[PDB]
Amino acid sequence: QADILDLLSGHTDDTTIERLAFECLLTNMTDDRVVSLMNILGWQGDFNCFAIGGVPSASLASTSLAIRKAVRDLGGEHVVIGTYGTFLLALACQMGAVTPEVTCTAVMPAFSEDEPLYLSPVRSGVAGASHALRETMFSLQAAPALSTPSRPLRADELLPERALLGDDYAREELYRNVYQVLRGENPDDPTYLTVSTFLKYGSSLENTAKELNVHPNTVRYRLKRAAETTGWDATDPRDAYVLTTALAIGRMRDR
Amino acid sequence: DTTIERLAFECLLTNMTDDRVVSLMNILGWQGDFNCFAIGGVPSASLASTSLAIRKAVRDLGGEHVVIGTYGTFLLALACQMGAVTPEVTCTAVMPAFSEDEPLYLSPVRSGVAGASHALRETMFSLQAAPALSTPSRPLRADELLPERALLGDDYAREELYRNVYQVLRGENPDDPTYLTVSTFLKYGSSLENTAKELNVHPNTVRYRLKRAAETTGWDATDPRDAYVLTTALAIGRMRDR
């Protein structure tokens, strides 16, 4: 298999090294060679990082300058920047005052107000870097499915659309963080059955109560609990679509 | 014989359709732009017994070629459509070989190696998607599990949602408000009254438009299963187009 010198095709300029690390990370390559490339760029050891992505406000060069300056002004010294289609993605090393919300606020003006903007969670090491860049890429590709997107879009806002695009990270989160959390450890717990039944029956409290032989208030209470544990409120049309998707993922995976 | 067939099967199931695969298929006797279809399900008794029953059933129907493989608990068979070998007739002949207590799928007829791969893969994805539905048809309908197949990575299910649902809904002309109405209706969780209020139109106008959409697409936004299918299609179309 190709070594880091093969990958570099004789180049030693950091622009090429950066673009190469960017493409490796975006394409899910997290092996030692990528660790070496990030090493060369200055990303030492088990670093923390996060990503911001969107469409440049005026130009790619202008946005890149703005982002490097903002990272510098906040006490950081590493940010890997690359383009993907019309999108510019930036992976910042979390150090000094470079933290996600503050960094996102500082660079927002360099991104078009007329296009989606996404801020990733903090992730660790090269594998996290790849994760941050990919969830950012998939979120931006998924954003058009959303009627009224937050700005910036954050976190798990686009799970089902990301899953539809083939994002393994989104499938896994729907399985682990929604479906499996709903199920819990106790199989006699009624929450999962109640959410499932509620969705099946048109998001009707009355029909769910009728189906399950419980008081409507009891269904209400269970849905609220499921909202607390998963972050998704079945009574909200957007969240209900997310939950429905999670149940499909879970059922296909477990049977 | 058997070994080459199993290798061809893996290649097809894993979406390898390049000339090396064509050449394997040539060796097996599948020539040119052949027609084929697939059938899949859980064996009534055993994988070996079901394989045999399918081979024999196809042979008796004048067929000479079948490629049989496994995916998890499922037996998947690709049959070359020759002689009296047709999908429905073949399916009927082999149903005893598949358990009544598990899903079953019969693909449409497809052509060539690309077609063979599609037939086997849509069969795998359909069987895999089935647990998502409470009471699926037997055999599973081709249009029954599109969002679920898409979620698994079935690119043909994505395309079908795009072409047969989203683009059909959107139509030739931008002025037609049927699409906007369905879009808005889904956004508001299939609330007739909230949709009429939001669009500033009469609720009857909303009902009429939803019925039109149900007629042209085959999906009724007032049914929660169909609403999910529609919502999936709009997402796919919006991500693809803009």
Place this chain on the structure above:
Amino acid sequence: ADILDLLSGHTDDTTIERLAFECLLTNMTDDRVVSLMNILGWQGDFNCFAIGGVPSASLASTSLAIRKAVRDLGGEHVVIGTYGTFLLALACQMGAVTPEVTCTAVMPAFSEDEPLYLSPVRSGVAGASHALRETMFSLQAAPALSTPSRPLRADELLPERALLGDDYAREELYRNVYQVLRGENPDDPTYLTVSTFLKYGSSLENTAKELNVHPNTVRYRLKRAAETTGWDATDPRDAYVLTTALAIGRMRDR
């Protein structure tokens, strides 16, 4: 490289078996290996175990004897390959094909003068790779021991396997010896006593002096560690296993 690239135009089950074997032996557990195993008839999260040793007469003879034995026991699939002087067989466990019975059945086909190993039952391609590799590494490690058991015990050659690069052996030392003994208590009297004892080369006197306790206090703590881990630090072999585990744990935990 896809499965066809790996095959290099071969479509014979013999080359396919050899390729699957080599992938497993080199710790490749990805989709292509799953497909290769698919092709050989190994579907899903199967159970399997491995047997390995030096053939009593010939590879061909031992292979024939193994395939016969497995079939007579009602088994369908056995992947057989060779590494150096060793023959390794991976059997699908089903019907009456279970590890001890199978091992007993095929013992006559392996040299008495050479080590023999039977793996635990494991599952899936990852399990198959693990079983074949622990078998390889155990056979390679055996010469380090003067009179090992036959077959070799799963826990008998951990440091030596680890020295050869066997990551499962490192893991097992870390989890089953080091962690079991230390927990979150570097200051637990037993752990501290074992640690100090080894540091002083198993000298009861020097250890008691260093810890400022009575020798009998050192003795019962070592006895506890022995009962807890199965390793008795007063035995030079066991002491070497314990020392290796402590090094592994320390390097890993910081």
Place this chain on the structure above:
Amino acid sequence: DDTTIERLAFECLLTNMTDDRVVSLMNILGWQGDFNCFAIGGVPSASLASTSLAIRKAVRDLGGEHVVIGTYGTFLLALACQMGAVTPEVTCTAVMPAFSEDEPLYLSPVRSGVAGASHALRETMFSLQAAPALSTPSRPLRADELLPERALLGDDYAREELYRNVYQVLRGENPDDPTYLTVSTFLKYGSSLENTAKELNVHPNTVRYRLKRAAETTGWDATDPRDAYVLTTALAIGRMRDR
């Protein structure tokens, strides 16, 4: 820029790449011919930046012209070209205050050429990773101090040295020499001179002296528990390799 080239060469060497491409890169950095070099590694006392600065200043003051500096995990590693007064102990003494006193420090032997440079950096990395195993680490750690633990981590240089410089040296060319048998028996019998002597029908003192001879040829003294562990490891490596 220069920093980039240097970090690239560092990564190649650390990753055991010693091919013509790497040789050429080192040549461009100014490392030419069959140069002598050594490595020092540890944890920066204050920061990566300031430790690097202090190392380069020390090497400059000592009359040296070339140092390649990189990181592994929390470690800073420096490869120095041996020239002027840039020699291992002097250089180590000059740069030691730049490394944390609460963390291990390692100084490699002198090595030759690009292959030697790669060897020096890797034995340094592995030794630093292995250091926590040691109860009473010297400062700096040196040379072959961590052989068995390095072998446990998969360092091929350690496995090779255990076989070549320890196990093979014990055996020598003469099967009439009792060194190997004595070391072997002594370890087997729990480092008991009395029981070893009883087994070999020899006086305890003869056993002791034979072990001291082994210490002369290999540097490892079986009467010391640390060294006994190292020797036990070398026997295992050797026995596995010769069958």
